[PDB]
Amino acid sequence: RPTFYRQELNKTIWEVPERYQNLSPVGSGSVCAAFDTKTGLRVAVKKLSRPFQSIIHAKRTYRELRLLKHMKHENVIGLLDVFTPARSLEEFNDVYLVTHLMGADLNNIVKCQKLTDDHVQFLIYQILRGLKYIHSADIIHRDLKPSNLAVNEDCELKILDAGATRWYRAPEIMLNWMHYNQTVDIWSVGCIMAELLTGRTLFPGTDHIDQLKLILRLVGTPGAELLKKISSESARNYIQSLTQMPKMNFANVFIGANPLAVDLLEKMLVLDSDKRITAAQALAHAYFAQYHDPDDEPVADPYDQSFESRDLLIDEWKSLTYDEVISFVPPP
Ligand SMILES: Cn1nc(C(C)(C)C)cc1NC(=O)Nc1ccc(Cl)cc1
Numbered sequence: 001r002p003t004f005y006r007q008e009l010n011k012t013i014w015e016v017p018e019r020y021q022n023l024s025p026v027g028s029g030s031v032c033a034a035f036d037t038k039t040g041l042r043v044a045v046k047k048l049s050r051p052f053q054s055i056i057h058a059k060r061t062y063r064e065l066r067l068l069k070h071m072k073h074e075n076v077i078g079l080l081d082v083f084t085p086a087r088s089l090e091e092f093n094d095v096y097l098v099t100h101l102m103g104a105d106l107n108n109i110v111k112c113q114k115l116t117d118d119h120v121q122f123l124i125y126q127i128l129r130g131l132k133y134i135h136s137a138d139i140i141h142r143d144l145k146p147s148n149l150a151v152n153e154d155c156e157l158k159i160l161d162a163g164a165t166r167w168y169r170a171p172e173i174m175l176n177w178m179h180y181n182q183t184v185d186i187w188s189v190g191c192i193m194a195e196l197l198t199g200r201t202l203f204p205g206t207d208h209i210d211q212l213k214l215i216l217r218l219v220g221t222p223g224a225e226l227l228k229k230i231s232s233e234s235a236r237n238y239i240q241s242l243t244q245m246p247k248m249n250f251a252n253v254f255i256g257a258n259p260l261a262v263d264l265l266e267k268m269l270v271l272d273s274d275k276r277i278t279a280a281q282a283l284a285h286a287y288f289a290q291y292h293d294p295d296d297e298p299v300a301d302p303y304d305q306s307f308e309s310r311d312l313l314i315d316e317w318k319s320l321t322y323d324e325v326i327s328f329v330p331p332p
Pocket residue numbers: 031044045046064067068071076077097099134139140141159160161162
């Protein structure tokens with residue numbers, strides 16, 4: 001145990017190792033920017049909010065620590081440190097996570113700077129590279145969106161999950177298909193890419209039903225091959241009565257754009273999730289010829305997520321989370 005110190009920021013009490021100095025809030029879990037003295041770099045410190053209040057909250061805390069500890073990739077958020085002031089399992093009630101401070105997210109970059117095709121290839125390439133890694137650990141993001149993409153002054157990017165919200169969501173998630181293959185994240189990428197190319201939100205729906213309406217206007221109402229696969233009689237009938245929107249020609253939609261960018265978008269923005277390009281396939285697409293290195297697109301170690309099936313007591317999840325804090329080994 002290093003030495004800790006108390007400070008109040010925005011009516012929140014923060015107890016951190018003296019290692020971390022100059023704390024100033026960035027967001028509300030609550031996040032502070034800090035100076036890491038041992039390494040002399042700026043970091044973000046997140047104080048977990050009510051981590052062990054319910055069984056579901058306690059499992060989320062554990063899930064969050066388990067995940068961040070596992071993520072070891074350039075284009076994915078990584079855990080620099082995890083600490084608790086607690087001297088013992090009985091004293092355990094707060095969790096803090098430490099990661100790189102990246103100065104800005106992808107909205108910010110898009111909403112005032114017009115991006116070149118080269119900017120788009122590089123930024124999307126990095127999202128796909130990080131996604132290949134995420135997906136190889138049998139993890140699905142489910143909420144990919146520009147605010148979950150941190151970007152530095154070299155436009156190097158990492159994927160995170162900080163916790164408008166639905167403009168990037170796969171149509172199957174908004175019909176609560178409740179199965180979801182990993183290509184839901186690829187839908188999200190198509191939406192992000194289109195917006196980097198045009199500077200405009202692809203599907204800026206006002207509410208849930210407007211969202212879907214806008215999606216179908218571009219990609220059309222489901223074709224016969226898709227409808228064939230819908231096991232739910234009600235879902236089928238919901239779908240089949242809506243006016244039968246034709247699939248738009250993307251070349252006629254994304255006018256100024258690289259024909260290779262258009263081809264890739266067509267392969268990502270498919271209603272049928274069985275037919276969407278995977279992260280690994282997308283990396284070898286010609287759009288990214290300048291960036292693609294098949295020997296530098298690493299996959300993750302096996303990730304044991306059997307805890308996901310488990311129904312445990314708050315204090316069990318708490319103890320399990322406490323073990324993970326203790327076993328943490330900081331990066332090189
Ligand atoms: C839950 N989750 N899932 C992922 C992915 C899927 C991107 C690996 C990442 C995370 N969690 C986070 O990204 N958590 C997090 C913690 C501290 C800060 Cl300052 C910012 C974010």
